[PDB]
Design a protein around this motif. Structure first.
Motif, PDB file in Angstrom:
ATOM      1  N   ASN A 270      -0.909  -9.888  -9.318  1.00 26.50           N
ATOM      2  CA  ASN A 270      -0.681 -11.266  -8.893  1.00 26.50           C
ATOM      3  C   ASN A 270      -1.983 -12.061  -8.825  1.00 26.50           C
ATOM      4  OD1 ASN A 270       1.987 -10.611  -8.730  1.00 26.50           O
ATOM      5  ND2 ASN A 270       2.149 -10.762  -6.500  1.00 26.50           N
ATOM      6  N   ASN A 271      -2.935 -11.606  -8.013  1.00 30.28           N
ATOM      7  CA  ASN A 271      -4.225 -12.271  -7.900  1.00 30.28           C
ATOM      8  C   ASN A 271      -5.259 -11.271  -7.412  1.00 30.28           C
ATOM      9  OD1 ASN A 271      -3.246 -11.998  -5.310  1.00 30.28           O
ATOM     10  ND2 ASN A 271      -3.971 -14.000  -4.605  1.00 30.28           N
ATOM     11  N   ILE A 272      -6.529 -11.610  -7.619  1.00 33.77           N
ATOM     12  CA  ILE A 272      -7.639 -10.767  -7.201  1.00 33.77           C
ATOM     13  C   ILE A 272      -8.654 -11.617  -6.453  1.00 33.77           C
ATOM     14  CG2 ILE A 272      -7.300  -9.198  -9.143  1.00 33.77           C
ATOM     15  CD1 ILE A 272     -10.127 -10.521 -10.110  1.00 33.77           C
ATOM     16  N   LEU A 273      -9.406 -10.971  -5.568  1.00 37.63           N
ATOM     17  CA  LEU A 273     -10.486 -11.649  -4.870  1.00 37.63           C
ATOM     18  C   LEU A 273     -11.569 -12.069  -5.854  1.00 37.63           C
ATOM     19  CD1 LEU A 273      -9.146 -10.958  -2.215  1.00 37.63           C
ATOM     20  CD2 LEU A 273     -11.290  -9.947  -1.435  1.00 37.63           C
ATOM     21  N   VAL A 274     -12.193 -13.205  -5.578  1.00 37.55           N
ATOM     22  CA  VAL A 274     -13.297 -13.666  -6.429  1.00 37.55           C
ATOM     23  C   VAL A 274     -14.474 -12.707  -6.275  1.00 37.55           C
ATOM     24  CG1 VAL A 274     -14.990 -15.480  -6.751  1.00 37.55           C
ATOM     25  CG2 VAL A 274     -12.583 -16.059  -6.446  1.00 37.55           C
ATOM     26  N   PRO A 275     -14.998 -12.144  -7.366  1.00 38.08           N
ATOM     27  CA  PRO A 275     -16.033 -11.105  -7.235  1.00 38.08           C
ATOM     28  C   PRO A 275     -17.347 -11.599  -6.654  1.00 38.08           C
ATOM     29  CG  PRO A 275     -15.011 -11.093  -9.423  1.00 38.08           C
ATOM     30  CD  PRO A 275     -14.617 -12.372  -8.768  1.00 38.08           C
ATOM     31  N   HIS A 276     -17.651 -12.894  -6.747  1.00 39.64           N
ATOM     32  CA  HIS A 276     -18.963 -13.373  -6.324  1.00 39.64           C
ATOM     33  C   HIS A 276     -19.102 -13.359  -4.806  1.00 39.64           C
ATOM     34  CE1 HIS A 276     -20.316 -14.001 -10.252  1.00 39.64           C
ATOM     35  NE2 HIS A 276     -19.881 -15.230 -10.464  1.00 39.64           N
ATOM     36  N   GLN A 277     -18.089 -13.845  -4.093  1.00 43.34           N
ATOM     37  CA  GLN A 277     -18.104 -13.872  -2.631  1.00 43.34           C
ATOM     38  C   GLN A 277     -17.437 -12.593  -2.129  1.00 43.34           C
ATOM     39  OE1 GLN A 277     -15.216 -14.968  -0.390  1.00 43.34           O
ATOM     40  NE2 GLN A 277     -13.788 -14.707  -2.102  1.00 43.34           N
ATOM     41  N   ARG A 278     -18.254 -11.579  -1.863  1.00 46.57           N
ATOM     42  CA  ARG A 278     -17.750 -10.269  -1.481  1.00 46.57           C
ATOM     43  C   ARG A 278     -18.871  -9.499  -0.803  1.00 46.57           C
ATOM     44  NH1 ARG A 278     -14.372  -7.269  -6.192  1.00 46.57           N
ATOM     45  NH2 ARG A 278     -16.411  -6.274  -6.499  1.00 46.57           N
ATOM     46  N   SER A 279     -18.493  -8.415  -0.130  1.00 43.60           N
ATOM     47  CA  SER A 279     -19.463  -7.613   0.597  1.00 43.60           C
ATOM     48  C   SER A 279     -20.389  -6.874  -0.366  1.00 43.60           C
ATOM     49  CB  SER A 279     -18.756  -6.616   1.515  1.00 43.60           C
ATOM     50  OG  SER A 279     -19.616  -5.546   1.864  1.00 43.60           O
ATOM     51  N   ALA A 280     -21.481  -6.350   0.185  1.00 50.80           N
ATOM     52  CA  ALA A 280     -22.459  -5.603  -0.595  1.00 50.80           C
ATOM     53  C   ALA A 280     -22.102  -4.130  -0.744  1.00 50.80           C
ATOM     54  CB  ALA A 280     -23.847  -5.734   0.038  1.00 50.80           C
ATOM     55  N   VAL A 281     -20.988  -3.684  -0.155  1.00 53.04           N
ATOM     56  CA  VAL A 281     -20.590  -2.281  -0.243  1.00 53.04           C
ATOM     57  C   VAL A 281     -19.860  -1.963  -1.538  1.00 53.04           C
ATOM     58  CG1 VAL A 281     -18.357  -2.587   0.883  1.00 53.04           C
ATOM     59  CG2 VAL A 281     -19.590  -0.405   1.137  1.00 53.04           C
ATOM     60  N   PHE A 282     -19.444  -2.978  -2.293  1.00 51.28           N
ATOM     61  CA  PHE A 282     -18.656  -2.772  -3.502  1.00 51.28           C
ATOM     62  C   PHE A 282     -19.505  -2.435  -4.721  1.00 51.28           C
ATOM     63  CE2 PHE A 282     -14.368  -3.898  -2.245  1.00 51.28           C
ATOM     64  CZ  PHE A 282     -14.568  -4.596  -1.074  1.00 51.28           C
ATOM     65  N   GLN A 283     -20.830  -2.349  -4.573  1.00 53.58           N
ATOM     66  CA  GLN A 283     -21.692  -2.050  -5.712  1.00 53.58           C
ATOM     67  C   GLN A 283     -21.436  -0.664  -6.290  1.00 53.58           C
ATOM     68  OE1 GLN A 283     -23.853  -4.381  -6.809  1.00 53.58           O
ATOM     69  NE2 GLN A 283     -24.051  -5.798  -5.079  1.00 53.58           N
ATOM     70  N   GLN A 284     -20.858   0.239  -5.512  1.00 53.73           N
ATOM     71  CA  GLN A 284     -20.556   1.600  -5.923  1.00 53.73           C
ATOM     72  C   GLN A 284     -19.111   1.912  -5.574  1.00 53.73           C
ATOM     73  OE1 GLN A 284     -24.243   3.573  -3.989  1.00 53.73           O
ATOM     74  NE2 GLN A 284     -24.160   4.493  -6.035  1.00 53.73           N
ATOM     75  N   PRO A 285     -18.488   2.864  -6.272  1.00 52.30           N
ATOM     76  CA  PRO A 285     -17.056   3.110  -6.060  1.00 52.30           C
ATOM     77  C   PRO A 285     -16.743   3.480  -4.617  1.00 52.30           C
ATOM     78  CG  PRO A 285     -18.075   4.856  -7.367  1.00 52.30           C
ATOM     79  CD  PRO A 285     -19.035   3.719  -7.337  1.00 52.30           C
ATOM     80  N   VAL A 286     -15.641   2.923  -4.110  1.00 51.41           N
ATOM     81  CA  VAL A 286     -15.166   3.179  -2.757  1.00 51.41           C
ATOM     82  C   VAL A 286     -13.650   3.315  -2.795  1.00 51.41           C
ATOM     83  CG1 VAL A 286     -17.069   2.075  -1.534  1.00 51.41           C
ATOM     84  CG2 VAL A 286     -15.124   0.716  -2.295  1.00 51.41           C
ATOM     85  N   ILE A 287     -13.099   3.889  -1.730  1.00 51.03           N
ATOM     86  CA  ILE A 287     -11.661   4.082  -1.595  1.00 51.03           C
ATOM     87  C   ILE A 287     -11.254   3.716  -0.174  1.00 51.03           C
ATOM     88  CG2 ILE A 287     -12.057   6.527  -1.136  1.00 51.03           C
ATOM     89  CD1 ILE A 287      -9.243   7.060  -2.238  1.00 51.03           C
ATOM     90  N   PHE A 288     -10.113   3.045  -0.042  1.00 50.65           N
ATOM     91  CA  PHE A 288      -9.588   2.612   1.246  1.00 50.65           C
ATOM     92  C   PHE A 288      -8.314   3.384   1.556  1.00 50.65           C
ATOM     93  CE2 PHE A 288     -12.037  -0.881  -0.450  1.00 50.65           C
ATOM     94  CZ  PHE A 288     -12.787  -1.300   0.625  1.00 50.65           C
ATOM     95  N   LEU A 289      -8.228   3.925   2.766  1.00 48.47           N
ATOM     96  CA  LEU A 289      -7.083   4.715   3.191  1.00 48.47           C
ATOM     97  C   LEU A 289      -6.441   4.092   4.425  1.00 48.47           C
ATOM     98  CD1 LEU A 289      -8.755   8.258   2.974  1.00 48.47           C
ATOM     99  CD2 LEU A 289      -7.449   7.134   1.171  1.00 48.47           C
ATOM    100  N   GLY A 290      -5.279   4.628   4.787  1.00 48.42           N
ATOM    101  CA  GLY A 290      -4.570   4.194   5.975  1.00 48.42           C
ATOM    102  C   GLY A 290      -3.543   5.229   6.363  1.00 48.42           C
ATOM    103  N   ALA A 291      -3.157   5.206   7.638  1.00 46.44           N
ATOM    104  CA  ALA A 291      -2.236   6.209   8.149  1.00 46.44           C
ATOM    105  C   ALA A 291      -1.415   5.622   9.285  1.00 46.44           C
ATOM    106  CB  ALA A 291      -2.979   7.463   8.622  1.00 46.44           C
ATOM    107  N   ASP A 292      -0.284   6.268   9.560  1.00 49.12           N
ATOM    108  CA  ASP A 292       0.619   5.841  10.617  1.00 49.12           C
ATOM    109  C   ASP A 292       1.567   6.985  10.941  1.00 49.12           C
ATOM    110  OD1 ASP A 292       3.042   4.519  11.937  1.00 49.12           O
ATOM    111  OD2 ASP A 292       1.690   2.805  11.752  1.00 49.12           O
ATOM    112  N   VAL A 293       2.046   7.007  12.184  1.00 48.93           N
ATOM    113  CA  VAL A 293       2.982   8.020  12.659  1.00 48.93           C
ATOM    114  C   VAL A 293       4.156   7.316  13.326  1.00 48.93           C
ATOM    115  CG1 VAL A 293       3.282  10.122  13.998  1.00 48.93           C
ATOM    116  CG2 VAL A 293       1.044   9.578  13.044  1.00 48.93           C
TER     117      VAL A 293
END
Length: 801
Positions: free
Chosen positions: A534-557
């Motif tokens: 649908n859409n993506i965040l603009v790459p210019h205005q973003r955090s400095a942590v995205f320079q290298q591959p990262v993964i986001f997780l989540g959990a719930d019970v």
RNA sequence: AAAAAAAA
């Protein structure tokens, strides 16, 4: 093994002025003596314990207590400002007779607590905190009626809630600590109880059958199951025996009438032979209490309901709607009521607090937050067409998707009677869908290849099998649902577990009443159901942590409700699969009931990492975790177990592989509200605070890293900010960086064009948990995993969204 | 079950 400390204070944003419902409390830096009191039998209630303790204090005074007023929490512990000269050993004193005993364990002090609060190095003594909390509550507990942590006064209930339920107002109190001082938390709350009318019209009301004299049948024989499940679990208040208080929970009830009720002579005959009283309604059933050998019976005409019982079972949609309407209110009214209650409380004229020497303020605390900037979003098509959110909402008209998906083969299954949809509504529905889709993104092509009526919930599998076998390259199926039938559950199960085809459901009302917003939202769903973007965040205005591959997780019970059958609890984990976080996968599985630990974390994380590698050709270097739904006071064990599980999962996949790990827990069930100080900066008709305001001082823990954030625009009532609390940090982030990252992640939700409360991983985990709950509904630990497992052909898509 | 927020 421990928790980090704050690496400074954020300094980005626009200053704002707010008010919080925190009132300061002062302490005298003295030493308080801790005692233990135990009374047998152990089944006595807290009110009776308090009554007997007060009687002993008042009328056994010279033996033990000399001019001293203790404070009693309610179960086991009492406190006294001065040392009791009875002795250090275990000395015990003494229906109508009760026995008490005394001890001396764990003398506490308050100078250490004051030093800990004034200098943030040593942890806060929970013993001293509990001492203050107990000493700040005695008069309210003695006078009002305590229901959990609520203090509902005995004056004014009103607002009937429907069938045998009401709403009671009150307030909630706590002594949560803060910086340099202790603070008292006050907040208005509402609950639900049972009205105390006679059971005959209680049943008449719950069945809405007040005109039963026209049909004097012994039983309905259709809603008896629900009547039994409603009545069971409640205490009666029969008064024919002289206020005997037969407080026996009604486990079982018979359905035969009093005429056919036999036991060694019916209830009518026994009552005649005993008291010479005639029963007006013999054809009604009877209530049975006690053991079967006792066979103690209760006719329905001479029984009542005891006041003061809470509700645990589920509710109905109309009841929920009317409850929300009754207790909605708004921010200025809430503020005025809080101030009125605090001014009326008058804590400075209380004998106990005066004896101890505590002083409490009168005005709300002043805080100074700030407002973070909002990101911008990138669309596609002929032109870029960037979007800038305004007050938390943007619009899509005039823009095309980032990656459209052309549709060539599709079908339609109708269901529902032909009366409400015969030939005319469907043509308009299809034409408007095609026009809207052509305008925005995916160009639906051609005419439907199938349109038939298939009334009956047992004719889904053969029809889907025939469609799959006949029409090659099927790509989407549209379903129309009349009401709240189990057809939805059956269709979900068949299309997810058995066959593996995409499905979409819609109500008849939204088909006979077309609307552009409804059609646009439906297209938004369909596009990512098929596998687009649908859409993506603009790459210019973003955090400095995205320079290298990262993964986001989540959990719930998710835990079973009430106290019914031991259905299993469900846990779920999701993770991203793209450089820009727009795609996700889920690995739900079940575990032992009533447990707050995820046991298969290692396997789940290993599977997610394998899929991420297979999809991206790289290996993640950082991991970000978002745990949701952690009860307070059970954090260290959970942190230990999970942190070990994650590290083990990382180790087993490959030797000498060790990435960074960040652990964050969110909390949305608390009692802190932030109001706007000025009248010229209220947003909306409800005067809520704007969207994107954070507070980090004066109401937060001294030497731990945490903050508040309100990232959505309220539309009804008053808002409720969320509280974040990091536990383990290994990537050495900064406060402003982490806050901005969370705020930006709040914008990635795909089912609407609005910012939301908690991040997308948390929503996705909750949604997949609920979908698994629907999957388990059929109509054995070995078959549960097979039931929850989803088909291979759909394991890869975002079927839950 | 077109979607968000509000009460337990």
């Amino acid at each position: 093994f421990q928790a980090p400390r704050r690496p400074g204070i954020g300094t980005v944003g626009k200053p704002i002025k707010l008010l919080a419902n925190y009132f300061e409390v002062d302490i005298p830096k003295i030493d308080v003596y801790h005692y233990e009191v135990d009374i047998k039998p152990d089944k006595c209630p807290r009110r009776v314990n308090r009554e007997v303790v007060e009687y002993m204090v008042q009328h056994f005074k010279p033996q033990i207590f000399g001019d001293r007023k203790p404070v009693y929490d309610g179960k086991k512990n009492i406190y006294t400002v001065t040392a009791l000269p009875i002795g250090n050993e275990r000395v015990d004193f003494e229906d109508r007779i009760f026995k008490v005993s005394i001890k001396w364990l764990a003398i506490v002090s308050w100078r250490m607590l004051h030093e800990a609060l004034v200098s943030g190095q040593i942890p806060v003594p929970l013993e001293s905190v509990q001492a203050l909390d107990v000493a700040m509550r005695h008069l309210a507990s003695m006078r009002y009626t305590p229901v959990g942590r609520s203090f509902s006064p005995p004056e004014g209930y009103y607002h009937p809630l429907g069938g045998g339920r009401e709403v009671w107002f009150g307030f909630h109190q706590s002594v949560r600590p803060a910086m340099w001082k202790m603070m008292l938390n006050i907040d208005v709350s509402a609950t639900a109880f049972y009205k105390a009318q006679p059971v005959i019209e209680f049943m008449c009301e719950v069945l809405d059958i007040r005109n039963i004299d026209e049909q004097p049948k012994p039983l309905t024989d259709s809603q008896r199951v629900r009547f039994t499940k409603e009545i069971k679990g409640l205490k009666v208040e029969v008064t024919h025996c002289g206020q005997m208080k037969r407080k026996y929970r009604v486990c079982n009830v018979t359905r035969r009438p009093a005429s056919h009720q036999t036991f060694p002579c019916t209830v009518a005959q026994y009552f005649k032979q005993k008291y010479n009283l005639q029963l007006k309604y013999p054809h009604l059933p009877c209530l049975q209490v006690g053991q079967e050998q006792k066979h103690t019976y209760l006719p329905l005409e001479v029984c009542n309901i005891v006041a003061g019982q809470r509700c645990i079972k589920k509710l109905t949609d109309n009841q929920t709607s009317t409850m929300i309407k009754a207790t909605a209110r708004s921010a200025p009214d809430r503020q005025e009521e809080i101030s009125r209650l605090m001014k009326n409380a008058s804590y400075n004229l209380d004998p106990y607090i005066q004896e101890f020497g505590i002083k409490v303020k009168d005005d709300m605390t002043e805080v100074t937050g700030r407002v973070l900037p909002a990101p911008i979003l990138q669309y596609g098509g002929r032109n870029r067409a960037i979007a800038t959110p305004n007050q938390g909402v943007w619009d899509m008209r005039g823009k095309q998707f980032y990656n459209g998906i052309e549709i060539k083969v599709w079908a339609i299954a109708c269901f529902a009677p032909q009366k409400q949809c015969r030939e005319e509504v469907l043509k308009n529905f299809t034409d408007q869908l095609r026009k809207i889709s052509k305008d925005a993104g995916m160009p639906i092509q051609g005419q439907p290849c199938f349109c038939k009526y298939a009334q009956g919930a047992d004719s889904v599998e053969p029809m889907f099998r025939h469609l799959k076998n006949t029409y090659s390259g099927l790509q989407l199926i549209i379903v129309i649902l009349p009401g709240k039938t189990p057809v939805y559950a059956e269709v979900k199960r068949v299309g997810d577990t058995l066959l593996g085809m995409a499905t979409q459901c819609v109500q008849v009302k939204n088909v006979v009443k077309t609307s552009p917003q409804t059609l646009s939202n439906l297209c938004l769903k369909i596009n990512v159901k098929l596998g687009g973007i649908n859409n993506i965040l603009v790459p210019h205005q973003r955090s400095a942590v995205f320079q290298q591959p990262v993964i986001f997780l989540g959990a719930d019970v998710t835990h079973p409700p009430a106290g019914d059958g031991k259905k299993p609890s469900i846990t779920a984990v999701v993770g991203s699969m793209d450089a820009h976080p727009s795609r996700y996968c889920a690995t739900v599985r079940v575990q032992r009931p009533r447990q707050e630990i995820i046991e298969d974390l290692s396997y789940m994380v290993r599977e997610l990492l394998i899929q991420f590698y297979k999809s991206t050709r790289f290996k993640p270097t950082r991991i970000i975790f978002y745990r949701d739904g952690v009860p307070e006071g059970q954090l260290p064990q959970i942190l230990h177990y999970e942190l070990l599980a994650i590290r083990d999962a990382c180790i087993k996949l490959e030797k000498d592989y060790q990435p960074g790990i960040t652990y964050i827990v969110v909390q949305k069930r608390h009692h802190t509200r932030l109001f706007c100080a000025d009248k010229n900066e209220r947003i909306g008709k409800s005067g809520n605070i704007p969207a994107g305001t954070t507070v980090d001082t004066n109401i937060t823990h001294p030497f731990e890293f945490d903050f508040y954030l309100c990232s959505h625009a309220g539309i009804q009532g008053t808002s409720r900010p969320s509280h974040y609390y990091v536990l383990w940090d290994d990537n050495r982030f900064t406060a402003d960086e982490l806050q901005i990252l969370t705020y930006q992640l709040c914008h990635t939700y795909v089912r609407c064009t609005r910012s939301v409360s908690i991040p997308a991983p948390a929503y996705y985990a909750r949604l997949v948990a609920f979908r698994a709950r629907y999957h388990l509904v059929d109509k054995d630990p070995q078959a549960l995993a097979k039931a929850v497992q989803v088909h291979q052909d759909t394991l890869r898509t975002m079927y839950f969204a």
